[PDB]
Write a protein that binds this DNA or RNA. Structure first.
Lengths: 136, 58, 75, 94, 65
RNA sequence: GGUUCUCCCCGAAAGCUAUUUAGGUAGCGCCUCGUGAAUUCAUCUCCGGGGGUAGAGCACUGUUUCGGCAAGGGGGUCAUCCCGACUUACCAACCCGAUGCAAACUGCGAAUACCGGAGAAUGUUAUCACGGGAGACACACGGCGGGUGCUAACGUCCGUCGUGAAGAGGGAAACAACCCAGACCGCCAGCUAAGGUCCCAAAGUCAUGGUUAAGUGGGAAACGAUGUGGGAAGGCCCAGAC
RNA sequence: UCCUCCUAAAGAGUAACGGAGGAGCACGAAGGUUGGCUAAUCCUGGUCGGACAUCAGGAGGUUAGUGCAAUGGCAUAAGCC
RNA sequence: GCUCAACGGAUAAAAGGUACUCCGGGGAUAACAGGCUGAUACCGCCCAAGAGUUCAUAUCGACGGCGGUGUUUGGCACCUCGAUGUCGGCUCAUCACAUCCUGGGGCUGAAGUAGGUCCCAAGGGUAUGGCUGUUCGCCAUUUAAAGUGGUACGCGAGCUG
RNA sequence: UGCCUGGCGGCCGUAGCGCGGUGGUCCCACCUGACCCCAUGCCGAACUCAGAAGUGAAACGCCGUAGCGCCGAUGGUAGUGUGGGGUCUCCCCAUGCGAGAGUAGGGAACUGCCAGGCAA
């Protein structure tokens, strides 16, 4: 997992998830995995795919994880009554909006890069899509 | 300041007091009301807000 | 395990810009000093900018640092 | 070198913009210098494949609106977030 | 030296059966939350210790393990 | 817990504050009656205003990724006792460029809402002040903006509007709170609303052009698949391709 | 019980066993007025002094400071002498 | 002159027990059950490194994910506190299929015998006892198999207590 | 009046910074001395007096420079009041309102009062 070092707070609001994404463009790499859907990517999910992605390309190329969870969402201990303050932080989720590019890759030929992301897609909950960079 | 007829089509029950008072400002009372007024942005502005439930007859 | 609060102290603008006030009429009730006193406007110990003369209100932004000022024109 | 036919718009806002985006068309804007920014509407389908050619972003076009041909250059593009499709292209009148 | 309790989740079958004793009518209707284990000898993995956990007699573990 | 004849008129709330108070009560808000008063009050147009929320942005409070750079602690050929020559393959900040996040961040910033003034029309004066008498202070749900919850609940707690509460009638098969719509009364009168028009059951087995083979319609996901229609583009192609 | 920010949906106000921290004082001076002054942290050199001693110059710029928790505010200083 | 900090302060005053309990009320508010949800549990599935001599998918399958059922434990208090007798055993059962056996088939890391796994199928069948109040469970020994659950976790105006 | 300088306001980053050049009858700064008024929690630097030979580096003004900061359309997008709809943990449609960011481009100020100077 990827935990943000030294946060200002501990626990916050759950907020709302709506709106499109910022990183529509593809930089730092050649190809990427843009997110079509709108969901919640937990830390263990993001960790799972990235490990499994470099497994496919076999150490050649570099990865750009253009996101970070940094939003602590709690859980109450089971069988407890609804009340008595907020429970403890359990994991880290990042809100992914439609159009957010998750992982990047360069220095690797298209086809092998194609299957790596395709095998990285099955670890994710939300519906994604493949995307190619473009000059301007 | 041209003479213009205003028709009330729908009923105002599930509306806001802002929209309900607009009907009171135009004299529209019951369903099937035809009252003759004049034109100016002050009057037409009232029709501009609730044009969904009122029908205009210039 | 903290659950404490404070009953709000009613801040803000009680008499907005464009209305004729009386002498001693509180214009803006501010905790800080965002607004600074202009012509015929006094500053209290709680920096509550109130009126001195009688007339209408003008929210004129003046000063090199562009702080917001309020004055009163005799109206 | 791009036969991009276009028509001058008459409705330029939010509501009318998408009604033609549903009819396979997207708006553009030709601006440059002292002239007035001409509201341009063009067919979406065509340019969807025209930007596949890399030299499209660095060369002059042969865009014609009402007979007369204007020479312009591609400035920038605002594409759709997740759906790989065009929305609005900024044209610098060259 | 490096001690972190494993106890494999997805390897241990936990059975919740009712309790025993006194305490009213509360103890015999919703006291099924009481736990009874199920740790088969087939989830060993040290290869030598689990059989030495089966041969030497003690309670909590039957004649099968 | 119960509280017995009739008609007519108007018409609530389940909120704030305090409470040895939380199923009670008092004041106010809301209601009714009487009285006295100012084009008083509401909607709309215009004008004069501050707000900083949504969104957005990343100088600032923090946080995040990559690239360029970089002293210091240390590893080492070593000082082979400090100094010191050099490198740095190392932890590699400070800084520059590029990429994102934020209720408790703002170099920015709406729509609405709100306050004041002017003008027209409408409204049995709907605004306010005073006096008598009240009730009530356990609210529910739906839309929207949110906290908590598991972005579960016919869940719980707030802002706001509607409705029920205290409103039947029509529709959603049945169904307070969903949609349409406000019952003075009589009629074997007509026209429309939401919703529907083969039959049960009032209304078209309506008109034209397309679509699906699953009874899909008539419960649902990731994912998989020469189901199949439409549109665009690309490869090869009677120097005859699959 | 009181105070600050957020929740609080850009007026005010608005609840929860919702999210974060403080108060139950201090002072004749840190009050009033007059006059002057206004930084923090780094780079450089220099007696021991080296991580930060003092001074000098420079960059920088209010990230300082303000008896205290937090917010707003402050040099026309409410900051310092 | 009051930390009258329960801080609009009743008045210093005042700790507890009640299964010997009693009275007035409440499903506004708990225990069993039903209802909504499905965190948990159970079941199925997607992806796939690896194990499996070779080989991802004979057989399992980490790291992660998407759904279903409403049987475990729970969340909420919507129904009943001017009553809904609550465990287990006996008795009598009935239904569903995610099937223990019989039956019909695919694959096999299926030679034969004997097995593993999955699909179709609910007509019928689906232990006797020791120990414990027990459901469960353990054990001895049989059997083609001694299935899993719903039915107030069936059934006390039928029985035992 | 063309230009100058100094003082005080309006407008108050298009107005301001960094860099290069440059001005002195007049003006300003620097500068000379400080036994006298006054001054340093030491010190003629700051403060103030009495003069002002000399200079124009510094300071300030002026010109060029966009080398930086700043300003900022048109269009589109986000958002959204109101009335409807869907697949209703979010979006679509009609309609009114309409950003921020970014691009083109603009841009190193303008103006008033007063006092003497300058060739009048």
């Amino acid at each position: 997992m990827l935990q943000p070092k030294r946060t200002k707070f501990r626990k916050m609001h759950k907020g709302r998830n709506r709106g499109l994404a910022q990183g529509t463009d593809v930089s730092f790499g050649s190809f990427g995995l843009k997110a079509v859907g709108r969901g919640r990517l937990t830390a263990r999910q993001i960790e799972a795919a990235r490990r499994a992605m470099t497994r496919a390309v076999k150490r050649q190329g570099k990865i750009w994880i253009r996101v970070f969870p940094d939003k602590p969402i709690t859980e109450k201990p089971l069988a407890v009554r609804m009340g008595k303050g907020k429970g403890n932080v359990e994991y880290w989720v990042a809100l992914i909006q439609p159009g957010k590019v998750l992982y990047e890759m360069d220095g690797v030929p298209e086809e092998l890069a194609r299957e790596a992301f395709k095998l990285a897609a099955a670890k994710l909950p939300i519906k994604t899509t493949f995307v190619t960079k473009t000059v301007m | 300041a041209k003479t213009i007829k205003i028709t009330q089509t729908r009923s105002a029950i599930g509306r806001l007091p802002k929209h309900k008072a607009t009907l009171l400002g135009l004299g529209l009372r019951r369903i099937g009301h035809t009252v003759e007024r004049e034109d100016t942005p002050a009057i037409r502005g009232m029709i501009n807000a609730v044009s969904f439930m009122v029908k205009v007859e210039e | 395990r903290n659950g404490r609060d404070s009953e709000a102290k009613r801040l803000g603008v009680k008499r907005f810009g464009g209305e004729s006030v009386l002498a001693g009429s509180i214009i803006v009730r501010q905790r800080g000093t965002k607004f600074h006193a202009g012509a015929n406007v006094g500053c209290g110990r709680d920096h509550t900018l109130f009126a001195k003369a009688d007339g209408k209100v003008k929210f004129e932004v003046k000063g090199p640092k562009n702080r917001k000022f309020i004055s009163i024109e005799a109206e | 070198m791009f036969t991009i036919n276009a028509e001058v718009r008459k409705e330029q806002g939010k509501g009318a913009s998408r009604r033609l985006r549903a009819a396979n068309k997207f708006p553009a804007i030709i601006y440059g210098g002292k002239e007035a920014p001409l509201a341009i509407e063009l067919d979406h389908d065509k340019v969807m494949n025209m930007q596949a050619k890399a030299e499209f972003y660095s060369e002059v076009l042969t865009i014609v609106v009402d007979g007369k041909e204007i020479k312009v250059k591609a400035q920038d593009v605002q594409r759709h977030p997740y759906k790989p499709k065009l929305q609005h292209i900024d044209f610098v009148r060259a | 030296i490096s001690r972190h309790v494993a106890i494999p989740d997805g390897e241990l079958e936990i059975t919740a059966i009712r309790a025993q004793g006194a305490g009213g009518q509360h103890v015999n209707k919703t006291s099924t939350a009481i736990h009874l284990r199920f740790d088969i000898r087939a989830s060993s993995l040290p290869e030598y210790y689990k059989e030495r956990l089966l041969a030497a007699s003690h309670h909590l573990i039957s004649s099968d393990g």
